[PDB]
Each structure stands twice: as structure tokens, then as C-alpha cells.
Design a protein around this ligand. Structure first.
Ligand SMILES: [Ba+2]
Ligand SMILES: [Ba+2]
Ligand SMILES: [Ba+2]
Ligand SMILES: [Ba+2]
Length: 345
DNA sequence: CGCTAGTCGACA
DNA sequence: TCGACTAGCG
């Protein structure tokens, strides 16, 4: 996500309880709970031992939400965006490297620091997620697998009014333009809410409380799609945008050295990357639960060629998208693994 | 000041 | 995988 984003914007946060959303619909970044629940069984997962502790963990928050008369929508990650296909396979190996230290330290007498490495060799698989889905469906709780990043899917549900808020631990959800976010929510419903309208109560931001500018700042500060120019963080990135009153972000970026009173030359690999990163936050493919069709997160503008946005995600027959979204089609093999039909229940 | 990239803790 | 917390470097 965005390094230190929450701390930068903490002026816009607010302690709340989920009861607040009684009678309403809330989308969940279920992965966050999955990872946390995976912690309790990192050891067992590695040895291939049969563990389901992360399922019960996810259900604890789910049943907490239901007990307060809340309608949860569990959203899950899907395929890996092109353009991060590489940056991700990269983790594949480092996540396997840390799984090596555990095994040696466990056979030395140290079982205390060996375990610290297993938490970092934790691999949240699709099969693990599918288990959680079966549990949720069994309590009548709706589940939705995003075509690509749950971030965009979650953002879409919120902007479309399907859900009134999003429960997540992820910072760069705001960058996708979602209105209400609930961070740090615990088992009992005590969370820390961030409303997009309260961005204006951040002095540090100043004039960059608009969604477009807020997004430019986040990217300049350094996102997943594009690392920032080294020496640029939230404050500097904010400063540039908060200073240059020019609707032409392209020309603005090429003057970064001028605004910061620094001396940086704006490479070519970055100006293009910013355009792509931006197109990824705007137009990443999501699934419209209502019509049942694959769509971009935002309607295309008049200055965007859709045929060039393969890096934000590739389309598929809406039927294929439906089976993936329902959690029937395996992500990697595109091989059906379940026979679930939302219409018949 | 603020960045950065560094480590370190998350659960129980 | 993330975010939080710090040590030093503009
Ligand atoms: Ba993310
Ligand atoms: Ba996420
Ligand atoms: Ba950075
Ligand atoms: Ba301005």
C-alpha cells in the first residue's frame, strides 16, 4: 500500500463501533483476517499438517458482525494483475527462503526464533480462502472473489453504494477512491473509521483533499504499481501537488526538482509508469455483482485507450467471470472446483 | 523538518 | 503481507 499513509491522515480518523452500521451492508477485505488467522498456525501449514484455525478466526469476526445486525460481504483476491506478475513471483521465492531458516533453527535447540520466520513464510492459498467461503456461505453470508485485486472490487462496491463501508487493514484502499474505511477493527467491533469527506481536516494535506489529487500524491509517495523517486515520501509528494496549480499533472511531475528546490531529473521510465499506475487505480477490472458483468472500476474517460490497459487486467467472457467470482473456477488452473449456484439456495 | 529504507512486531 | 517505529541523511 502507501507507506505511513494512516499516520499522515490520522486527523481524519475517528474511533467508532460497528453497531453504527446496524441494518446496513459492509464489505470485508477478508484476506486481512486470513493472514492474521494464518499466524496462529504457521507451523502446521508448513509441515503440511491439516489445520483450519484460520477459518474459525475469520468466522469470529463474521459472527460478530452478524450479531450486530450487519450484512457482511466477504471479498477475496483473484488473479495477479499483469505488471505485478513479476514483482509477485519474486515473493514466491523470498517466502520460500524464510521457510528454510525455520527448519534449521528448529533443529539446533532454538524453536523460539525459528517460528518468527514461519510467520513470514506463510502462504495464503486459494484453497485456504475457499474453505473460509464454504463456512461463510453456510451462515448465509455473501462472498465475492474479485477478478483481480480485492482493493478495486472493495472500492467498487463502496462507490456503487452496494456497501456503506469497507473493513480492511490496507492503506492504499483510499487511493482507489472509497468513501468509508474501517481500520484496526478488533474481534468485538471496536474500529478506527476514515471518511473521505474528513480528509479536509488534515492540515498537512491542505489543498490535496480532492480524490484526483489525493491519488496523485499517493502514487508520487510510492505505491505498489510504481515505486517513488527515492527521497520522495508523503510529505514531499503532498508538497509538490499542494503547490503546483496546474491541471496538467504530466508537466507538473517533470518539474518536481523545481517545486522541492532539489535537483532530480525526471526519467522516462517513471513518467510512463505514473500514467500506468494511475490507469491501474482508475480502471482496474472489477466484477459488477448486479448485472453480473466484468467492468472497469471507473467509467473510461475521453483520454484513455482501453486496448492499452492490459496491465490493469484482461477481460474474459462474463460467464467465466461469473464462475471465478462465485468461487467455483480455480484462479490458476481455470478448472471448476465447486458447483455453487447463488440463484438456487 | 522529512525520508528512507531498516528492522521488527502481528497472534496468544 | 502489511503496517508501525527508528536511525541517520538531506
Ligand atoms: Ba494492496
Ligand atoms: Ba488487500
Ligand atoms: Ba517511498
Ligand atoms: Ba494548488
Amino acid at each position: 500500500g502507501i507507506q505511513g499513509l494512516l499516520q499522515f491522515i490520522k486527523e481524519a480518523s475517528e474511533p467508532i463501533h460497528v453497531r453504527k452500521y446496524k441494518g446496513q451492508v459492509v464489505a470485508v477485505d477478508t484476506y486481512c483476517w486470513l493472514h492474521k488467522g494464518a499466524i496462529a498456525c504457521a507451523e502446521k501449514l508448513a509441515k503440511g499438517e491439516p489445520t483450519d484455525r484460520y477459518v474459525g478466526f475469520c468466522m469470529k469476526f463474521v459472527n460478530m458482525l452478524l450479531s450486530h445486525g450487519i450484512k457482511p460481504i466477504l471479498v477475496f483476491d483473484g488473479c495477479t494483475l499483469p505488471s505485478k506478475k513479476e514483482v509477485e513471483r519474486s515473493r514466491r521465492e523470498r517466502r520460500q527462503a524464510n521457510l528454510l531458516k525455520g527448519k534449521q533453527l528448529l533443529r539446533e535447540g532454538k524453536v523460539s526464533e525459528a517460528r518468527e520466520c514461519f510467520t513470514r513464510s506463510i502462504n495464503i492459498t486459494h484453497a485456504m480462502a475457499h474453505k473460509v467461503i464454504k463456512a461463510a456461505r453456510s451462515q448465509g453470508v455473501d462472498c465475492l472473489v474479485a477478478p483481480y485485486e480485492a482493493d478495486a472490487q472493495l472500492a467498487y462496491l463502496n462507490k456503487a453504494g452496494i456497501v456503506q463501508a469497507i473493513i480492511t487493514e490496507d492503506s492504499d484502499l483510499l487511493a482507489f477512491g472509497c468513501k468509508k474505511v474501517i481500520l484496526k477493527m478488533d474481534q468485538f467491533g471496536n474500529g478506527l473509521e476514515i471518511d473521505q469527506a474528513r480528509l479536509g481536516m488534515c492540515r498537512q494535506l491542505g489543498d490535496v483533499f480532492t480524490e484526483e489529487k489525493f491519488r496523485y500524491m499517493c502514487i508520487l509517495s510510492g505505491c505498489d504499481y510504481l515505486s517513488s523517486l527515492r527521497g520522495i515520501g508523503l510529505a514531499k509528494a503532498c508538497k509538490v501537488l499542494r503547490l503546483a496549480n496546474n491541471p496538467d499533472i504530466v508537466k507538473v511531475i517533470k518539474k518536481i526538482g523545481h517545486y522541492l528546490k532539489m535537483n532530480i531529473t525526471v526519467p522516462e521510465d517513471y513518467i510512463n509508469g505514473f500514467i500506468r499506475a494511475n490507469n491501474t487505480f482508475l480502471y482496474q477490472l472489477v466484477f459488477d455483482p448486479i448485472k453480473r458483468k466484468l467492468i472497469p472500476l471507473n467509467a473510461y474517460e475521453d483520454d484513455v485507450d482501453p486496448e492499452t490497459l492490459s496491465y490493469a487486467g484482461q477481460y474474459v467472457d462474463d460467464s467465466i467471470a461469473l464462475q471465478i467470482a462465485l468461487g467455483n473456477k480455480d484462479i490458476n488452473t481455470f478448472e471448476q472446483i465447486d458447483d455453487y449456484n447463488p440463484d438456487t439456495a
